[PDB]
């Protein structure tokens, strides 16, 4: 259904990516480098429906809900690189923040051979549907915590690509102009 397409765990902008320009490329990828300390913030991605491209066409072709928002990450580490972050990774448009976000939906990942995580964001929103408008559905934040750990090694930098999905509901509602098309 349309849903597998939006659905089948796609990859994401998410943001514009301080690019190589690898960051189109990327998209899915925040950066993973070592770090002077580990706790410092490196990201803050904003989610809509609108914005980042795969989400965009679907969102215009509809303007209601049914769904959830699953973001599952994957890693290109090495023997030699390793890595860990934690990602929020945030419903709807709260606190913008550290602990508030940790307080959020939650996943803790090891980035070793697992090569996949499920951080799923739900739309925790007063109404079942949010319509397509400009300000924001809300933020997804990532925090890279501890880098990479290592070897000799791997050129230093490691990268992740984020994955996006919704359930439960697969099904939305109200079709509207789809981003792609003719005239």
């Amino acid at each position, epitope marked *: 259904d349309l849903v597998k397409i939006a659905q089948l765990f796609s990859v994401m902008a998410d943001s514009t990516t301080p690019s190589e320009n690898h960051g189109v490329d990327a998209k899915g990828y925040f950066k993973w480098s070592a770090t*002077t300390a580990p*706790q410092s913030i490196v990201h803050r991605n904003i989610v809509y429906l609108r914005l980042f491209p795969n989400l965009n066409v679907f969102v215009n072709s509809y303007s209601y809900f049914r769904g959830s928002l699953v973001l599952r990450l994957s890693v290109y580490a090495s023997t030699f690189n390793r890595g860990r972050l934690r990602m929020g990774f945030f419903p709807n448009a709260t606190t913008d923040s550290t602990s508030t976000l940790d307080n959020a939906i939650y996943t803790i990942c090891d980035i070793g051979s697992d090569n996949s995580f499920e951080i799923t964001i739900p739309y925790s929103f007063s109404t079942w549907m949010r319509k397509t408008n400009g300000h924001p559905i809300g933020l997804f934040q990532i925090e890279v915590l501890n880098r990479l750990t290592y070897n000799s090694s791997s050129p230093s930098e490691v990268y992740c690509i984020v994955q996006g999905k919704m359930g439960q509901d697969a099904r939305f509602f109200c079709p509207t102009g789809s981003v792609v098309t003719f005239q």
Partner: antibody, heavy 122, light 108 residues
Framework: EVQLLDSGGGLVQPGGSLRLSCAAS????????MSWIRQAPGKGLEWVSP????????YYADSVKGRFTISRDNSEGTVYLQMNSLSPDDTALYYC????????????????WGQGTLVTVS | EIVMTQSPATLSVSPGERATLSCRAS??????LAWYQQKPGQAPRLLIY???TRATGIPDRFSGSGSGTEFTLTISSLQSEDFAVYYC?????????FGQGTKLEIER
């Protein structure tokens, strides 16, 4: 218009401890990062510590490490340095300063300095 | 361990002439470099940040360029009030650090 006003510095014995304060105005204080930088007689400027917004992450220079502690009061928009373990190398004129990251980069440029408080650890 | 270094420890320039201050770094710093001017007994003054953007209230005779590990502060026609010490500083990585300063003195 940024006004960074600094009090609290005075002559102190070695092994002593001072608490410097610097109060800010005319900018949204609680969004900006803030640093203390000092200036020794017969010396240039050394950044000492900076604190990040929420009073979250703070960093220090190796000289100052465990001796000095940086704390913000955002409810009164003030900045604090607690200088323990004072040695003569700490004699200086201390300035509070306000840094900004601009748009979405990683550099923090200072845009306003205060007037200077003198700490004579002798 | 990022260390900045200003070549002219003291620049003696005639009034009205131009002056050029250099500031290298021991590792790449991209464009997060800023320049400061300091008169005796006063707080420092921000002249340039982002390597090249002039701050508000800074005349056009002041200008900065360069990137990486090498920067320059050019002042077109040095005026009487441009008599001072100048410091560069980088913010590309912690801890943040300043140069040892360049003293621009009136040459006669």
């Amino acid at each position: 218009e940024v006004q960074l006003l600094d009090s609290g510095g005075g002559l102190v014995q070695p092994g002593g401890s001072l608490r410097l304060s610097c109060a800010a105005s005319g900018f949204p204080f609680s969004d900006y990062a803030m640093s203390w930088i000092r200036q020794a007689p017969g010396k240039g400027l050394e950044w000492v510590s900076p604190i990040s917004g929420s009073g979250g992450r703070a960093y220090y220079a190796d000289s100052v490490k465990g001796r000095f502690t940086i704390s913000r009061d955002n409810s009164e928009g003030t900045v604090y340095l607690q200088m323990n373990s004072l040695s003569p190398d700490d004699t200086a004129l201390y300035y509070c300063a306000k840094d900004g990251s601009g748009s979405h980069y990683n550099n923090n440029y200072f845009d306003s300095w205060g007037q200077g408080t003198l700490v004579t650890v002798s | 361990e990022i260390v900045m270094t200003q070549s002219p420890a003291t620049l003696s320039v005639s009034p009205g002439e131009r002056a050029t201050l250099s500031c290298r770094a021991s590792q790449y710093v991209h464009s997060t470099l800023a320049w400061y001017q300091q008169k005796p007994g006063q707080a420092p003054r921000l002249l340039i940040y982002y390597a090249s953007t002039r701050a508000t209230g800074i005349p056009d005779r002041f200008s900065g360029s360069g990137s990486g590990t090498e920067f320059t502060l050019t002042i077109s026609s040095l005026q009487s009030e441009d008599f001072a010490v100048y410091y560069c500083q980088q913010y590309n990585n912690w801890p943040y650090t300043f140069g040892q300063g360049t003293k621009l003195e009136i040459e006669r």
